[PDB]
Amino acid sequence: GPIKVELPTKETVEIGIVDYEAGASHGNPVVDFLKRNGSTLEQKVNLENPIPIAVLDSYTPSTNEPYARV
Amino acid sequence: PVMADLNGGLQFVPELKEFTAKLRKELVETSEVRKAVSIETALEHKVV
Fold first, then answer.
1. Are A22 and B45 in contact (CB under 8 A)?
2. Neighbour tally for A28: CB within 10 Å
3. Cβ pairs A/B, distance under 8 A
4. What totals of helices (H) and strands (E) does chain B contain, helices first?
5. Torsion region of A10: left, alpha or beta (phi above 0 gives left; psi -120 to 50 gives alpha)
6. Contacts of B44 in chain A (CB under 8 A)
7. Residues 7-26 of B with CB under 8 A from A
8. What residue of A is the nearest CA neighbor of B44?
9. Separation CA B47–CA A58 (nearest Å)
10. Which end of chain A is less enclosed by CB atoms within 10 A, N or C?
11. Residue B34 and residue B23: Cα distance in Å, rounded?
12. Rounded CA gap, B40 and B48, in Å?
């Protein structure tokens, strides 16, 4: 994969490529190194408290044929 | 009164503080770099 560097404008630009190839192995050393030395960026950001939206009732049809046919 | 200089020519080294600090940092850096690289190579071996 690519390696990117953050800029003063917070835009990241590619500066190199990760390139690991190995035969028989018990693990991936690249991912272990990055886990132990870096931090993982997570896109999803949790609210401090979930906001309930609704609790709804639904029913399954009495025959599965129409869904199969469509 | 007699004044004996038992300094072994150290007075002829200019900017002595900076020179000795440079020597010390050279050594410390070499030691730390080597230790860190060795630890990481060992861990990579242990995972692969």
1. no
2. 14
3. 17
4. 1, 0
5. left
6. 29, 32-33
7. none
8. A29
9. 49
10. C
11. 17
12. 12
Nearest residue of chain A to residue B39 (CA atoms)? A33
Residue type for B7, please?
N
Chain A residues with CB-CB distance to B under 8 A? Answer: 22, 25-29, 32-33, 36
**Which amino acid, one-letter code, is at A50?**
P
Q: Which residue of A has its CA nearest to B40?
A: A33
Question: Does B43 contact A at CB distance below 8 Å?
Answer: yes
Method by which this entry was solved? cryo-EM
How far apart CA A70 and CA A66 sit, in angstroms, is: 6
